[PDB]
């Protein structure tokens, strides 16, 4: 009786509705769109076909389309250089391609079209998170080896702003360069090359020779990452947007800070400090027309992912490794982020070791729950935490598979869709969870080392639960 | 609804697929939906990893480990699928990789093309004992059979065409002489000199229906009128014999694997003789004389009991030709016994270029391929009475078919012409209905279910392609 009678998969896909899942492949070098209504992959693209010899396809965000099945657009970026050598693949390659591309891709109802390489046009090769603006007409990219982020206009493919963030440690000893505090300097960059182009293509600008991998923020202090400016790294990760407009939050993994910027005048306004027991925030002081500083007397723990709730009234930052928890600020005062204060922290006895790390997140459309991945190194099963986002309590934890990464949600709020990625070498897949029962409904096969996933949105209200407000 | 009931109908089988233009290989667990492992060829410095064909060897427990061969194409094969790449100098490719799954990940064990000097980019087939494998190439018109344990060449042959009429449009229709030459290594350490694009007569593998494009002057290359377009070396499951398919002359040349000689040439076309003789003209050279070539042919393969051989005529006829090969002792006695035709099968399309039998031999499933935008599908053929039963539409660009070794489900892949919809399709062999499609990032031109026993190879990438 253990073998099911002949069973068709139609009922399974029919429940999800008409939603398209987009995924980058990391070491596979691909991007792909899947139709959750039929199980068909609608299209894919392999970067090496176009002459990118190191297409580590990393992060992406998609823009609202009135009918994704007829067409949509998205940005996907890459890493490059010695990032090829950090996931245990026994490649004999001597000189890896430079990478750090930023590609604009359009689905036309049949296939993907590679529209442009925005890194080649602008000179900004940035390899970490890609976030759409709340209006769907721009996007940001950050990089945690160069510590640069920029916001871009989609229609003109031009740079709206670019900033460099630097650390100056109180103690020059690598082991204590963050623990014992330091000064973070924020500089608004100006282009230096003809046509308003920046000089940051490829590996140019890297302070360290490869990324701090998932779970690996302390590998730099710990003396395992080479580079020419090791003790100046902050590891910028993402720029996430307040859905009510005006503010963005730039996450710096090593100092454990989220720097709030005013997008109206492009200035940093306050620094939120992640660690439990530390102040809600630290002031930002302007020291020159283009330069601001934040002073920290210690750094308690690094931090990971950040996000605003769909209504913009809560901001989350995940402390990791030295503390593993979800830190929550009351951001209800839209007029003045200097007033944003810590209101809750989600903790659990099972989070007391180095791992699991509280990781990527997605909120339900109504804000009532947030789903948060729980990351561990091999071989512990990674999983999903379900959190009550009104009372800030852990409801449930479920095991999924190795190397759990990002989460998306269908825009009717019914199904969370996530990816796990096998550390680029073992089991990978797409996991779907029902948000009413909080149960896994199934795993679909996936050739991918994905560190992202998005469901293509139809409207700007969808972006409030997409790769815009959170990572 | 949960997917558990869906995966629970399958049993414990691993599907292995190459990605073609994705550059990947992957294994998926049909009992849970998980991808077990994958490998990306570009990560290893293969700059044009068009991952093409593959065969897996019997494993006592595939979930604890298994081994396979996957090859690549290279050169201007990058440029024939409509991708608007600006690459000017494509990687040489034509690698042959041995890959092992260890229960957790894939391990690239060796590049047998580098070790042997034979870079061969079309079908890979396992031998019936699971201890060797063949690779053929239809740009170079070379094939070889290899020993797995020693990673060494057992035999290699070159096949060449001398046309009766040197005009390109008439170079096959008006006949010619096919010369078969046993090759010997020419470099130190018993290595051949055929790596990368070395030896190509044409700049890409002929497409489905592509014999007409070669005749019309649309395929570039240095020896366009001397190509036969070898496709595969498929094995008689009873041992002793292999069949080398040559697409352009529409011939399957039968080899004796013990003394490495060609013994007879089966001629695909309806209305033509069952076979032509092979004449030995020198110690290492044999000839086949053809006064005309009535039509090309492509898919070729044996039924699981070895008693039937199939060759699919395409282009100028469109049918499945069937020989009685019940006489294992003497292939010169193999004789045409049936032809599967249909009013909907004419010309180049559908192009019937992959198949799989049920373990009991009662049915054969055959791909029905067409160019965009015609829906592609699967034909179900009665392999006892030799008649078409049913055709099912699947999606764009239907490619290979495998079967679970209990006979219950055909598992196939479709591939989007490297640019549109792709997926894994699963069909119930009792109802002959699709039970579902699973997503697949792949342009796969092959697929296999990892076998446990040598008997399983009778219905894997051994007896058919
Ligand atoms: Cl054998
Ligand atoms: Cu049972
Ligand atoms: Cu991140
Ligand atoms: Cu990542
Ligand atoms: Cu073939
Ligand atoms: Cu192919």
Automatic annotation (TrEMBL), chain A:
Residues the entry annotates as binding Cu(2+) 2: 58, 211, 451
GO molecular function, one term: metal ion binding
PANTHER family noted in UniProt: DIHYDRO-HEME D1 DEHYDROGENASE, PROTEIN NIRF
Name of the protein: Twin-arginine translocation signal domain-containing protein
Database matches in InterPro entries: Host-pathogen_enzymatic-act, N2O_reductase_N, Quino_amine_DH_bsu, TAT_signal, TAT_signal_bac_arc, WD40/YVTN_repeat-like_dom_sf
Cofactors: Cu cation
Domain of life: Bacteria
Residues bound to Cu(2+) 6: 334
UniProt binding sites for Cu(2+) 4: 129, 237, 304
Binding site for Cu(2+) 1: 26, 58, 451
Binding of Cu(2+) 8, residues: 360, 405
Positions bound to Cu(2+) 5: 129, 237, 305
Positions that bind Cu(2+) 7: 360
Binding-site list for Cu(2+) 3: 58, 451
From TrEMBL, chain B:
Cofactor(s) required, per the database record: Cu cation
Annotated residues for binding of Cu(2+) 5: 123, 231, 299
Source domain of life: Bacteria
Binding residues annotated for Cu(2+) 7, in chain numbering: 354
Positions bound to Cu(2+) 6: 328
Residues the record lists as binding Cu(2+) 8: 354, 399
Keywords: Metal-binding
Stored InterPro entries: Host-pathogen_enzymatic-act, N2O_reductase_N, Quino_amine_DH_bsu, TAT_signal, TAT_signal_bac_arc, WD40/YVTN_repeat-like_dom_sf
Chain sites annotated for binding Cu(2+) 2: 52, 205, 445
GO molecular function: metal ion binding
Binding site for Cu(2+) 4: 123, 231, 298
Residues that bind Cu(2+) 3: 52, 445
UniProt binding sites for Cu(2+) 1: 20, 52, 445
Entry protein name: Twin-arginine translocation signal domain-containing protein
Lineage: Bacteria, Pseudomonadati, Pseudomonadota, Hydrogenophilia, Hydrogenophilia incertae sedis
